Design a protein around this ligand. Structure first.
Ligand SMILES: Nc1ncnc2c1ncn2[C@@H]1O[C@H](COP(=O)(O)OP(=O)(O)OP(O)(O)=S)[C@@H](O)[C@H]1O
Ligand SMILES: [Mg+2]
Lengths: 635, 327, 448
């Protein structure tokens, strides 16, 4: 009832505000509008009078009251001010989202968010904001990041989510854990819960379609569950029965049983991929899942899948590991066909460098990881879970390195080394997020390798010495590497604080083609020396450019509104870039630090008197408390 | 930085100072880039000398050198430039002699404090060494010139540092230019001979700079030596072991103990220390590894004696006299 | 005044002192009599009195028939058990092995009291059966306890746990060790009398030997057993060093390490697996340096616990310190435990990597706090009851001015003569050497 009330009330309100009657009798419209208003008034009365003994706690009851009451009085759009109804409703939805016994489900929350955050209104200052303290921001940062991971969100909502994430990082210096995970094993373990089987996983995936679908999709899901539950009841399958009793609530477990009837022929309606170059079309997963599920008709859970795998969009990627595991576990003692085919194709799929094939390679790696956690029948140790498929772990390590999953790559590399008893270990070690791991790798010694270690280490004068030697010896011999040397030097000199020397090293260079290291170095120096006349590129993925544009606009402006607009554009673009996906940890932490810098800028731009000045200073002091022990790049 | 940011006028002076500093370290590329940026070159005579030391070190032989200047860097630069842009030894000798004459007239001019005086005398020394290697006719005089460099090293080890650094940098320029310019050399002096002599002169300068504890100059020298190995393998020279040992010494003197030890062990593993010029005995290499492994505690004192010290005594091959066996 | 303001920090000391030794007992008895007279602490001192009496009674009560090693007996069948349960129901206190932080506001009402006891208690293998009680507190958490009785000395273990906790607190003042959260995990020892105590049962750990001995036969069914290796090494205990080293090589060629699986089978998620393996390496490095500097010995598999929720090791039983271990009949001549399984838990990079850099950061922060470590050991020097030599009772229980010498050795291990890199290289060379590991006692399972 909570989710239904939220969704229905929101939809009703939007319909009440919208008024465009051209092919409708202009009086017929007033009739229906009055009818709708009275239904809204009656429903709001009913909800205010609602009280259930099934509420988990009194916290849930107060959440229900607040959600329903605020939703009854919201406007057409949402804002983030302090004391309005839209902001209280947004805060309630967010606070509920991060919990263990939550009222709203994903469809209802998505409807309410798309109704509020579709056209937003971010407060000018932050004293009028619904989240204004560093503590509320640390508390709500994870949920506000989970929220701005959609596509139906306006620009002002992304600016507000940027302000919240920046305040949270400036007050804690910690990345939300949603940004740090690299495998999908947490989703697969959240689904297949209770017993921990693939059947429960598929049943949760199908059950989630009944509530989050359009008429067709909900029909397909209800049909599949009806056939599954009826065949589990008739044939007395205890494993599948125990899966259903824990995946489905009781009302849906009862409405899926053809007790006094028989399953109708309208439900059970039926509908190369084992080779390379097939990994590149965006429907590889769907075709392969159908191909596999058709090969095991005796399993009822796989028999009803092709009608959902083909129609519903994005379902095959979510259900791929469960399907593969079900098939492989089924034909374990019979002739192992799927194992042979998949393990012969993996030799070609894992060695696949391509941009269109990266997103299916991620799914293959996650399937291998998921099979590593499922117990073989008749095993002595976890070392026999290497017999689900036959993976060449060096190839899987290289593949996971290409996709940017470095801890997964390290795990695969360790499994490979066990299988044996160093060109991929270098790429793993350079990028994995540990201060000391890199020094464990052995390589042949020379002045160049010591220079590489010193530049990884971000040393100061010590790398300046070796780089100056290399740079001189390459300028003298008219070598072409000197350009690269110059690039490195610039980097070194911008990690020390010597901005004048790096500036002079910048102008000299005339081929500015240094992937993105030179792009960021050309604007850090300009900001430090306060050179506010560079033409800044537009639509750039660099934090230095964003911060530079904010400060530049602060220089060349006579009114605070232009500066606020530029700051908000910066926050919005930074959040979109964080949502873009494939970023390793250093770039991620740089973007979060850009959010923090823009937020502090926006904080001091909005002071009105002395007391707020002193409060800003005190905020700086508390953040110092966190900074003393934090990472050095962020600080 | 603080003067560039505040649009202060002292930054120019700051830049001047920086140039000076960066030319006393050996970082010539950074000072070169600091030079072009500056556009009011009005820095009494500190900038005049700094504009030609850097050009000589980076071998930029197309600057228009002022005429009748009291600067030693300009004199030495004009000599080396004329060595670059000339097809006959007579033009080079004439330019060297003009340099000596002008330097002596300037020393006679009178009011010079001690640093300028010693700079002028070092310019005379550099021109004299240039004139000495320009006039070699066969191999025996080449070897006699090298021996002269060694005796002068004996004096240099304890001398003042400005004089030593100036003479040794000019000697490096001289040997490299002589190795490059094939038409200035005599008849029977092939390019392998000039290369080998250049390498030996550099290794000698590296010893001298190591005692003075000049880290950046040993770094510069070992880098510039490591860059000569590709062009030395095509002339038929085997100088990889001595040059890699110089690199290992630079590493050890900057504090990288494990990198130095690994580099010496790689020299010992894959290298033919017998058939190669600039000789390198296997027993001194083994004892060097043993000393460095003992200092870094990298292995137990029972394996140090079994892998490095007793193999060294066995490599002596019954010889119980000399400095190798003494070490 | 300390016992009045902070009762859960001084009253157990007073109880132990009451219930030059005669003068100390008399003075502690006078303080106890005065404690049971004032208004602030009057519902607290009787509680601790009665509760400690029944805890001691339960500790001393050993019956080979009523208490079988390995069983799980309900504590209501002995008269001691029923008296204990009743007395604990009538007197509510915080669990005696809970670590209470000192309150500046002098408010100890937020402390969980013992609500009830779980009906049963486990039993471990020994002569005087150590029994593992469980207590369900007010806030609903389970506090397990070892009620240890016999002839042991827990005051040594308690003093050394306090010293190790103080030094690990020193580690927090330096950037490199604080950035990595280098430190040790503590537990709580509470001596009741000279023959009994309460030890905190660390929550969700597993002893290192109890993981390693089944795993060795689960992953390598063709290797020797742990018992066969122990017996083969113990038979050649009265032979020349050459034969001992030959037997040790022969045994370890048929015994391969399996520690790397502890992380692949408790943490299958790669993100979590990496973080937990790093926790293991860092805590091993910190306790290795910290137990080299303080001569910590008796580091066999039953004194090292593996925390299978956070990955990080816990060292218990810290009483043989200050090099008392190389005085035993078969001396312990290694600086710390770094056998092939401890090192196998660290991955492709056996030592060079996290373990060596963390050893160096720890040892570099320790020799910059040599004044504070000197102060801690000096406070130890004015403790009349701390023994600086290992009494032949425990020396027989282990293998089937003394203050001035010990503190001087500690002070010369912290000397800045050698660099940290060279010191750590030497330590890791002598901790993993086969000629050092081959002549260790067979109960110190070095083959493992
Ligand atoms: N405080 C504690 N917390 C958790 N586990 C413990 C604790 N003390 C001991 N253990 C473990 O529980 C068991 C109790 O060991 P004890 O029998 O008391 O002494 P012991 O060390 O096993 O005997 P020895 O002399 O070492 S052979 C052992 O397996 C220990 O690893
Ligand atoms: Mg013990």
């Amino acid at each position: 009832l909570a989710g239904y009330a939220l969704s229905s009330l929101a939809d009703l309100r939007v319909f009440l505000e919208s008024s465009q009657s051209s092919t409708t009798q202009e009086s017929q419209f007033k009739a229906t509008k009055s009818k709708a208003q009275e239904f809204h008034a009656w429903f709001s009365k009913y909800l205010a009078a609602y009280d259930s003994p099934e509420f988990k706690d009194e916290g849930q009851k107060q959440a229900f009251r607040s959600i329903t009451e605020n939703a009854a009085h919201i406007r057409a759009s949402g804002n983030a001010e302090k004391g309005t109804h839209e902001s209280n409703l947004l805060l309630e939805i967010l606070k509920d989202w991060g919990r263990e016994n939550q009222l709203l489900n994903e469809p209802a929350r998505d409807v309410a968010l798309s109704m509020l955050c579709g056209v937003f209104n971010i407060p000018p200052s932050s004293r009028l904001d619904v989240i204004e303290t560093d503590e509320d921001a640390i508390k709500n940062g994870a949920v506000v990041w989970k929220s701005c991971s959609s596509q139906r969100l306006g620009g002002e909502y992304l600016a507000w989510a940027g302000r919240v994430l920046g305040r949270s990082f400036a007050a804690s210096g910690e990345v939300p854990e949603d940004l740090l995970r690299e495998s999908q094993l947490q989703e697969y373990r959240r689904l297949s819960q209770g017993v921990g089987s693939s059947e429960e996983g598929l049943l949760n995936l199908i059950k989630s379609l009944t509530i989050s679908g359009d008429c067709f999709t909900a029909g397909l899901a209800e049909a599949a569950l009806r056939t599954i539950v009826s065949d589990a009841i008739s044939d007395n399958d205890h494993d599948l029965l125990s899966a259903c009793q824990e995946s489905l609530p009781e009302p849906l477990l009862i409405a899926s049983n053809w007790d006094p009837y028989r399953t109708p022929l309208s439900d059970q309606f039926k509908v190369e991929v084992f080779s390379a170059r097939a990994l590149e079309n965006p429907n590889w997963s769907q075709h392969l899942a159908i191909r596999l599920a058709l090969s095991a008709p005796k399993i009822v859970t796989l028999r009803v899948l092709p009608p959902i795998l083909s129609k519903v969009k994005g379902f095959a990627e979510r259900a791929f590991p469960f399907v593969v595991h079900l098939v492989l576990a089924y034909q374990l003692d019979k002739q192992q066909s799927a194992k042979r085919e998949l393990s012969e194709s993996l030799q070609e799929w894992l060695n696949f460098t391509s941009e269109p094939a990266k997103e299916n390679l991620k799914l293959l790696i996650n399937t291998i990881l998921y099979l590593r956690t499922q117990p073989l029948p008749g095993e002595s140790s976890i070392a026999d879970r290497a017999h689900w498929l036959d993976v060449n772990m060096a190839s899987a390590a290289a593949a996971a390195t290409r996709c940017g999953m470095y801890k997964v790559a390290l795990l695969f590399a360790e499994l490979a080394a066990e299988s044996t008893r160093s060109d991929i270990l270098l790429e793993i070690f350079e990028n994995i997020d540990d201060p000391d791991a890199y020094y464990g790798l052995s390589q042949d010694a020379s002045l160049s390798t010591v220079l590489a270690r010193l530049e990884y280490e971000n040393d100061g004068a010590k790398s300046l010495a070796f780089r100056g030697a290399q740079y001189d010896s390459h300028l003298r011999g008219r070598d072409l590497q000197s350009r690269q040397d110059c690039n490195a030097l610039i980097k070194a000199l911008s990690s020390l604080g010597l901005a004048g020397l790096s500036n002079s090293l910048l102008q000299s260079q005339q081929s500015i083609d240094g992937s993105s290291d030179s792009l960021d170095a050309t604007f850090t120096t300009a900001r430090k020396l306060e050179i506010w006349n560079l033409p800044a590129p537009v639509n750039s993925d660099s934090w230095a450019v964003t911060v530079y544009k904010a400060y530049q606009s602060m220089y060349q402006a006579q009114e605070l509104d232009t500066v606020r607009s530029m700051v908000h554009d910066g926050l919005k673009n930074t959040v979109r870039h964080l949502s873009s996906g494939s970023l390793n940890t250093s770039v991620l932490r740089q973007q979060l630090g850009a959010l923090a810098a823009l937020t502090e800028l926006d904080d001091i731009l909005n002071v009105r008197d002395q007391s707020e000045l002193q409060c800003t200073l005190a905020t700086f002091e508390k953040r110092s408390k966190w900074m003393m022990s934090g990472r050095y790049a962020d600080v | 930085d603080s003067h560039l940011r505040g649009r202060d006028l002292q930054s120019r002076q700051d830049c001047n100072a920086l140039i000076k500093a960066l030319s006393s370290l050996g970082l010539a590329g950074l000072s070169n880039s600091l030079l072009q940026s500056q556009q009011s070159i009005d820095g009494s005579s500190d900038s005049l000398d700094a504009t030609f030391t850097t050009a000589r070190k980076l071998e930029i032989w197309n600057l228009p050198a002022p005429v009748n200047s009291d600067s030693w860097a300009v004199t030495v630069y004009k000599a080396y430039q004329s060595m670059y842009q000339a097809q006959e030894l007579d033009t080079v000798r004439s330019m060297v002699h003009d340099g000596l004459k002008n330097t002596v007239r300037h020393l006679s001019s009178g009011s010079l404090n001690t640093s300028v005086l010693r700079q002028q005398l070092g310019a005379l020394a550099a021109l004299t060494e240039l004139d000495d290697i320009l006039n070699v006719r066969d191999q025996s005089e080449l070897q006699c010139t090298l021996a002269t460099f060694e005796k002068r090293s004996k004096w240099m080890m304890s001398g003042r540092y400005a004089d030593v650094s100036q003479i040794l940098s000019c000697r490096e320029t001289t040997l490299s230019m002589w190795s490059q310019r094939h038409n200035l050399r005599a008849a029977g002096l092939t390019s392998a001979d000039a290369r080998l002599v250049q390498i030996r002169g550099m290794l000698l300068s590296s010893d001298i700079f190591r005692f003075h504890r000049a880290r950046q100059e040993t770094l510069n020298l070992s880098t510039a030596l490591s860059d000569l190995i590709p062009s030395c393998e095509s002339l038929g020279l085997s100088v990889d072991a001595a040059i890699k040992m110089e690199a290992a010494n630079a590493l050890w003197d900057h504090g990288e103990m494990i990198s130095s030890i690994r580099m010496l062990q790689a020299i010992d593993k894959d290298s033919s220390l017998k058939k190669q010029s600039v000789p390198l005995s296997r027993s001194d290499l083994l004892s060097k590894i043993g000393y460095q492994v003992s200092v870094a505690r990298l292995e137990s004192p029972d394996a140090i004696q079994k892998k490095y010290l007793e193999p060294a005594l066995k490599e002596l091959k019954g010889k119980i006299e000399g400095r190798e066996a003494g070490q | 005044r300390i016992c009045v303001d902070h009762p859960y920090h001084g009253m157990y000391h007073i109880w132990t002192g009451a219930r030059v030794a005669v003068s100390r007992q008399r003075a502690t008895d006078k303080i106890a009599k005065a404690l049971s007279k004032n208004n602030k602490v009057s519902s607290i001192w009787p509680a601790i009195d009665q509760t400690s009496r029944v805890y001691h009674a339960l500790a001393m009560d050993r019956d080979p028939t009523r208490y079988k090693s390995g069983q799980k007996v309900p504590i209501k069948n002995s008269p001691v058990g029923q008296n204990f349960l009743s007395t604990m129901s009538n007197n509510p206190i915080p669990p005696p092995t809970l670590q209470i932080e000192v309150s500046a506001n002098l408010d100890y009402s937020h402390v969980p009291m013992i609500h009830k006891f779980a009906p049963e208690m486990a039993i471990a293998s020994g002569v005087s059966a150590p029994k593992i009680l469980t207590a369900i507190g007010t806030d609903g958490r389970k506090y397990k306890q070892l009620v240890k009785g016999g002839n042991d000395d827990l005051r040594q273990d308690a003093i050394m746990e306090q010293v190790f906790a103080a030094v690990s607190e020193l580690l927090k003042l330096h950037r490199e060790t604080r950035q990595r959260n280098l430190g040790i995990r503590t537990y709580k020892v509470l001596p009741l009398t000279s023959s009994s105590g309460l030890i905190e049962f660390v929550s969700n750990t597993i002893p290192l030997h109890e993981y390693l001995m089944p795993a060795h036969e689960r992953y390598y069914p063709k290797d020797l057993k742990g018992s066969q290796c122990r017996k083969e090494i113990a038979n050649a205990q009265t032979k020349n060093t050459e034969t001992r080293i030959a037997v040790y090589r022969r045994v370890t060629e048929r015994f391969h390490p399996v520690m790397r699986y502890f992380f692949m089978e408790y943490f299958p998620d790669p993100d979590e697996w990496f973080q937990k393996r790093t926790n293991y390496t860092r805590t091993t490095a910190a306790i290795s340096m910290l137990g080299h500097v303080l001569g910590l010995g008796d580091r066999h598999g039953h004194n090292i616990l593996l925390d299978h929720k956070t990955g990080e090791v816990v060292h218990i039983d810290l009483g043989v310190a200050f090099e008392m271990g190389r005085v035993l009949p078969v001396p312990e001549l290694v600086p710390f435990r770094l056998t092939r399984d401890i090192v196998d838990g660290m991955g492709i990079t056996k030592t060079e990597g996290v373990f060596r850099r963390c050893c160096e950061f720890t040892l570099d922060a320790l020799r910059e706090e040599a004044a504070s470590i000197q102060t801690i050991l000096d406070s130890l020097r004015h403790d009349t009851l701390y023994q600086w030599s290992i009494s032949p009772v425990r020396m027989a229980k282990l293998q089937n001015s003394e203050a001035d010498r010990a503190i001087e050795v500690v002070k010369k291990k912290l000397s800045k003569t050698l660099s940290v890199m060279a010191t750590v290289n030497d330590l890791i060379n002598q901790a993993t050497s086969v000629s050092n590991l081959a002549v260790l006692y067979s109960g110190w399972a070095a083959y493992a």
